[PDB]
Structures are given as C-alpha cells and as structure tokens.
Design an enzyme around this catalytic site. Structure first.
Site, short mmCIF file in Angstrom:
data_model
loop_
_atom_site.label_atom_id
_atom_site.label_comp_id
_atom_site.label_asym_id
_atom_site.label_seq_id
_atom_site.Cartn_x
_atom_site.Cartn_y
_atom_site.Cartn_z
CB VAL A 26 -1.18 0.03 1.01
CG1 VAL A 26 -2.29 -0.92 0.59
CG2 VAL A 26 -0.73 -0.27 2.42
CB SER A 28 7.28 0.94 -0.22
OG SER A 28 8.54 0.44 0.18
N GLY A 29 9.27 2.91 6.68
CA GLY A 29 9.17 1.48 6.44
C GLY A 29 8.52 1.13 5.12
CB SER A 30 7.48 -1.55 3.41
OG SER A 30 8.81 -1.24 3.04
CB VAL A 31 2.14 0.28 4.97
CG1 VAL A 31 0.83 -0.17 5.62
CG2 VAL A 31 2.89 1.19 5.93
CG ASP A 153 3.83 10.91 11.36
OD1 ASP A 153 4.23 10.73 10.20
OD2 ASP A 153 4.29 11.77 12.11
C1 LIG Z 1 -2.90 2.56 3.25
C2 LIG Z 1 -3.75 3.63 3.91
C3 LIG Z 1 -4.93 3.74 2.93
C4 LIG Z 1 -4.21 3.16 5.29
N1 LIG Z 1 -5.45 2.87 5.67
N2 LIG Z 1 -5.48 2.53 6.91
C5 LIG Z 1 -4.28 2.58 7.41
C6 LIG Z 1 -3.77 2.34 8.70
C7 LIG Z 1 -2.39 2.51 8.90
C8 LIG Z 1 -1.55 2.92 7.86
S1 LIG Z 1 0.16 3.15 8.08
C9 LIG Z 1 0.52 2.02 9.41
C10 LIG Z 1 0.16 0.63 9.37
C11 LIG Z 1 0.41 -0.20 10.44
C12 LIG Z 1 1.03 0.33 11.57
C13 LIG Z 1 1.45 1.67 11.62
C14 LIG Z 1 1.17 2.50 10.55
C15 LIG Z 1 1.50 3.94 10.61
N3 LIG Z 1 2.37 4.42 11.73
C16 LIG Z 1 1.92 5.42 12.49
O1 LIG Z 1 0.79 6.03 12.32
N4 LIG Z 1 2.74 5.95 13.34
C17 LIG Z 1 2.45 7.02 14.22
C18 LIG Z 1 1.26 7.58 14.64
C19 LIG Z 1 1.58 8.68 15.49
C20 LIG Z 1 0.65 9.61 16.22
C21 LIG Z 1 0.08 8.88 17.44
C22 LIG Z 1 1.32 10.91 16.66
C23 LIG Z 1 -0.50 9.96 15.36
N5 LIG Z 1 2.85 8.76 15.48
N6 LIG Z 1 3.42 7.71 14.79
C24 LIG Z 1 4.83 7.61 14.57
C25 LIG Z 1 5.74 7.84 15.64
C26 LIG Z 1 7.12 7.75 15.40
C27 LIG Z 1 7.58 7.49 14.13
C28 LIG Z 1 6.71 7.26 13.07
C29 LIG Z 1 5.32 7.36 13.31
C30 LIG Z 1 -2.06 3.15 6.62
N7 LIG Z 1 -3.44 2.99 6.39
#
Ligand SMILES: CC(C)c1nnc2ccc(Sc3ccccc3CNC(=O)Nc3cc(C(C)(C)C)nn3-c3ccccc3)cn12
Ligand SMILES: Fc1ccc(-c2c[nH]nc2-c2ccnc(F)c2)cc1
Length: 325
Positions: A26, A28, A29-31, A153
């Site tokens: 979806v 590219s 980490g990579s998701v 994020d």
């Molecule tokens: C593909 C897209 C259509 C889509 N639809 N639903 C989703 C759900 C998640 C993602 S990206 C994903 C997937 C699995 C696990 C994690 C992620 C994204 N990571 C993430 O949001 N990190 C995050 C959230 C926050 C908040 C709590 C501040 C918001 N900070 N961080 C973060 C912190 C340190 C370094 C990097 C990220 C795509 N999906």
C-alpha cells in the site's frame, strides 16, 4: 509463538504469522494491506525499515511502538498487534505493527463538518497526552468507506500545512501548530485547492502573510530572532484579509472557525477542545463523548541511550503487548 511464512514484495521481505493473509503493498518502512483470519477484518501491517540502524532510528522505533501502544481512541491509529519473527533479544532486528485498514487517505458542508470534527476529536485526545503531531496533512488522515477518520503518521509537501512559527524556525512552538494544519486542511476541503502552496520556506511564509497579514506589534515583541524579525519586517506590510471574501460561498460558521484556527500568533489560536465546542459542529459535538488520554510517559524523549538499550526497551514492549478485546 505462531507459525510464520516468508514472502518478497516490492523488493522487501515479509515474515508474518499465518493469521495474516493476502499481503498487498500500500506504501513504501513499508506498509501492506492484509486479511486477519483471527478477527475477520482487513488490517494494515507496517514493517519497520532498518529499526536499529542508528541511535536516531532505534529511538524512533521505540517512540512509535510506545505511541501506538498508548493510543486508544476511535479517531487515532491504535495497535491491533505487534510481532517479530525473532524468538530472543539476540535475534531481534525486525518490528511489524498491525492496525485496522481504513483504505484511503484524505487526498458538501456536512461532509467537511464530520471530517474536521473527527480530526479535532482525535487531536483533543493526542494533545491531552502532551503529544504534538507536527505533521498533519491529508496523506496522514486515513478514511474508510463509512467516512470514519483516523489520524496517523505515515507526494504532498509537508511545509504546505506547517505552522508559520515552524517555517520561521521557532524552537518553542506549542500544540496549536496542529490547529494551524487543521485550518489548512479544512480550507482545502471547502475550496478544493491548497491554501498555501509554497515552493520553499521563504515563499510559504510570504503566502501565509498574504492571507493573515504581517505580524502586529503584540506578536513582533514575542520574536527573539533578529534574523526572523529582519526578514518579516523587511517584507512589504500586508493587512489581514477578510475571510468571508476569501472563503466566499462557505458556511459562515466554517469561515468563523477558519478565522480562529488560522491566527498568526499561536498564543491566540483556538485549541482542539475549544474548536469542538464551536457552533459549526453542533450536529456532532458531545462533551460526554470526546475523551481525553490516560497519562503518557514520555520521559524517554529526554534520554540519550545506546542502540542496544533502545533495542532492548523495544523488545520488552513487544513482549508486554496486550491486544484489545
Ligand atoms: C494505506 C492507507 C490507505 C491506510 N489505511 N489505513 C491505514 C492504517 C495505517 C496505515 S500506516 C501504518 C500501518 C500499520 C502500523 C502503523 C502505521 C503507521 N504508523 C503510524 O501512524 N505511526 C504514528 C502515529 C503517530 C501519532 C500517534 C502521533 C498519530 N505517530 N506515529 C509515529 C511515531 C514515530 C515514528 C513514526 C510514526 C495506513 N493505512
Ligand atoms: F512571521 C511570523 C511571525 C510570528 C509567527 C508566530 C506565530 N505564533 N508564534 C510565532 C513566533 C514565531 C517566531 N518566534 C516566536 F517567538 C513566535 C509566525 C510567523
């Protein structure tokens, strides 16, 4: 310990438990989008790219796991699962994070009201845990088919939605940098165009001031940097535009909220909690259904540790993880 399987997709290798099927790239980490057999729902799986490459990466890996394990809100990404193929700290070098798949990102007045209400409802929660997002933009807002939204994020330029105090390199910015971004997003949803499409940090600043006007004496007295002052005051003085005239056609309450979000002086910007109680969201607002977060321990943010220490702390967080019901 479940059974894992290996697969290569878009140059990346993925070792995931049996429960996760039909891995589809979806971003590219990579998701990867996937199907979760235990719960029956579509999931998004993030594989961390080089989690322990440097101290910066190792602390970032830890920060993300800690943040995601803490977020328990409908309008914020939460963790369904976290795993590693590794059976010990020694073998530990890959992290996978699992969440609900929404399916699309952010890029009618009732539509805009609902979408912004949800962003603000999730921001009230994150801001309550003393977290600043710092990079809210349409690509960081995940939306499903029911038009339900989650803040995350995860190309659209970051600087387009960045608060002017960050462009001006101010170190002491507050939580309202995220309200600025919300203002920018809301404007773009209402008009169909990027409010401030700057080509660099200088141009971006010029575009912002064209709308909100050049700082008044109250704000100018708050700027310590002679360089930031000698630049701003050297620009041709611009008055604050009439938002009713720039956002002509929009619901007057949406224009009124935009004026309160896009104020140049961040000390005078509306907070997420105050914005929720604005007349614009009268159809959605319920102060009994806009929760705050449990205390978030971010004392680790001030530490300077070795890669192995950040690595061992991440490993423990993976082991201690309790999935939601
Ligand atoms: C593909 C897209 C259509 C889509 N639809 N639903 C989703 C759900 C998640 C993602 S990206 C994903 C997937 C699995 C696990 C994690 C992620 C994204 N990571 C993430 O949001 N990190 C995050 C959230 C926050 C908040 C709590 C501040 C918001 N900070 N961080 C973060 C912190 C340190 C370094 C990097 C990220 C795509 N999906
Ligand atoms: F051109 C400008 C002038 C002031 C701002 C601004 C808004 N809110 N806070 C600030 C700020 C910025 C730098 N240093 C400070 F001390 C406070 C943003 C753009």
């Amino acid at each position: 310990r479940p059974t894992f399987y290996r697969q290569e997709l878009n140059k990346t290798i993925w070792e995931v438990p049996e429960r996760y099927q039909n891995l589809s790239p979806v971003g590219s980490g990579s998701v990867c989008a996937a199907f979760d057999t235990k719960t029956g729902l579509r999931v998004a799986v993030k594989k961390l790219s080089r989690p322990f490459q440097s101290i910066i990466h190792a602390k970032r890996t830890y920060r993300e796991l800690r943040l995601l394990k803490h977020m328990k809100h409908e309008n914020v990404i939460g963790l369904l699962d976290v795993f590693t193929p590794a059976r010990s700290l020694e073998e530990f070098n890959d992290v996978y994070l699992v969440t609900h798949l929404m399916g699309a990102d952010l890029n009618t007045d009732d539509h805009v009201q609902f979408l912004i209400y949800q962003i603000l409802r999730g921001l009230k929660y994150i801001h309550s845990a003393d977290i600043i997002h710092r990079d809210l933009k349409p690509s960081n807002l995940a939306v499903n088919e029911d038009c339900e939204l989650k803040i995350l994020d995860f190309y659209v330029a970051t600087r387009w939605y960045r608060a002017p105090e960050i462009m001006l390199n101010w170190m002491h910015y507050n939580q309202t940098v995220d309200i600025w971004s919300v203002g920018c997003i809301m404007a773009e949803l209402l008009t169909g165009r990027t409010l401030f499409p700057g080509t660099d940090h200088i141009d971006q600043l010029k575009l912002i001031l064209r709308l909100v006007g050049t700082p008044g004496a109250e704000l100018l007295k708050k700027i310590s940097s002679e360089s930031a002052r000698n630049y701003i005051q050297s620009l041709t003085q611009m008055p604050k535009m009439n938002f009713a005239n720039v956002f002509i056609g929009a619901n007057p309450l949406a224009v009124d909220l935009l004026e309160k979000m896009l104020v140049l002086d961040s000390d005078k910007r509306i907070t997420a909690a105050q914005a929720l109680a604005h007349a614009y969201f009268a159809q959605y607002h319920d102060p009994d259904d806009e929760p705050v977060a449990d205390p978030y321990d971010q004392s680790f943010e001030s530490r300077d540790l070795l890669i192995d220490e950040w690595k061992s702390l991440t490993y423990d967080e993976v082991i201690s993880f309790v999935p939601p019901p």
